[PDB]
Amino acid sequence: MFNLNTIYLSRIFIEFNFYFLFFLFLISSIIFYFSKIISIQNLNQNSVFNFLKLANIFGILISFFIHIISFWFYCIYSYNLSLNIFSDINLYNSNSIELLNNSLLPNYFKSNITIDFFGLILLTLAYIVGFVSILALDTRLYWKNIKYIFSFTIFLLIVYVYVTVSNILLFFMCYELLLIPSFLIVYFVSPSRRAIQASLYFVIWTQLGSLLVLIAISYIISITNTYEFNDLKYFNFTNSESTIIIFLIFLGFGFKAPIWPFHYWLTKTHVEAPSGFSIYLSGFLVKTALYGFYKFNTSIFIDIDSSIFIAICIMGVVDSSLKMWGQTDLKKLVAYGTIQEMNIIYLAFCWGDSCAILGGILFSATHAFLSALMFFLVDCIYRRYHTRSLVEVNGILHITPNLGLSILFMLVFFSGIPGTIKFISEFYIFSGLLEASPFICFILMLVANVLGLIGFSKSWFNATFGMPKKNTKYLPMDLSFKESYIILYCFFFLFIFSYFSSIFF
Amino acid sequence: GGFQKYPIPRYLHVGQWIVNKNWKWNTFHMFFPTAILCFMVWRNSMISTAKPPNYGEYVDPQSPVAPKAIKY
């Protein structure tokens, strides 16, 4: 019963949501530039900053709704396309349906849009995490950094082109564009003075991996003059070229997606970055690397043993889990948790295009939401209690019961209770790893889910419980409606996404 | 027996020695709707309930209800 109307509606929605975002950004930027001689806030109720905040927030939100609709259309379209290809067995019949483009808006960068489930999951993560982070950064943007209210819109446009393109070069360029806005945010919006050095560490560490990926892309392009991302089927790389490409790709994308030993920059940046931008970084900016690694390694044929890469990922997991205990800083502890989860996700991609990719994608989504939740809780603690250190913070539950309850439920979700996409992703990865290498699976599970979990829980429980006798004149009140509903939405997603259609998982 | 009662700040939403005057109506309006929700859940789930045969009943091996092996 599938008809061409659904196909064209899917394509039109995907194409036009990008232009909706772009036109919103363009209008907002034109207003901002041409309303004032100097593009800084006027400290009065009639400033354009209020309009810009409104436009950014409710462009992201409306584009997120349209993205939900377009993602559902894509799911139907992909399912029915697979059915059309698979169903017919007659040799004379073949599915050759050709679509003509609309005459209203042009194709951005003269590229035909191609959408995949992983790309749309990444785009949904971008939308939601960007919404949370923009909601967080309101107190940070003041009177000279208001120009960074558009950072998340720029991120959304970059990610949209990144996930809706079938061109290798455009793919790589979109991946590399993410550096400038993130560096500028960390440099100009971070309150702490150590953020200045943290930004440089972030730039250099990420750029080393960017150069590695650039070398790999140069190898692919120079050898294969193609750029369509599908002509690689008709060209085979020799053993030496293939091993060089996989090594470069893995190391370069692991610089971004933190792997052992390349997580020093991540720890520094998470500790010294804005509490609202740490959410976006951990939640989304480390998963574009995973998506790019998946695309490249599934496109290239590799005839090498992945034991070395699996060992690197497992070593990162073990290192982060063991170090969890020794952190009294909640933000650094959450950063180590992010490193652990990202290393597990990266390990999920070490078997080419096997079924491990499904667990990897689900784990990427759950880690995004869980890291957003954890960093937002740390943000609330730091903002109301003027410290994010375990020695200075104690007995949160008895003065701010809602915040303590949020911490406890965050710990329960992090533990991986059944009924959560966290548990589902752990089940996928461990079920595969048990047959792949059962002893390695046992070691990984033991370390991560006992030693790292206990180290993680020690600090959070100590902060939540106790007796806050110190500085009774300065104790805060409670979570606000904004914070409470953000926490509730994170919990709601982590719980209900387990009912998403199992066809794609 | 218990600890001596001490003042609790008004602004703080805590449960220390909280007693509600309207607890009777609150219980009435929290019990019955919960009972109706559970009744709906129960009748929904009963469609997918399984029970073994009764005392005087035996399962005919050739009846459709009897387990069937996969036919390659």
Partner: peptide, 26 residues
């Protein structure tokens, strides 16, 4: 019988640090 004064704040005594919190005891 006696009208007792309200429960003492002394029941929870504030703890004052007198020794360095070594990072080796984190």
């Amino acid at each position: 019988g006696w009208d007792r004064p309200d429960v003492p704040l002394s029941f929870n005594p504030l703890y004052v640090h007198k020794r360095e919190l070594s990072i080796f005891d984190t």
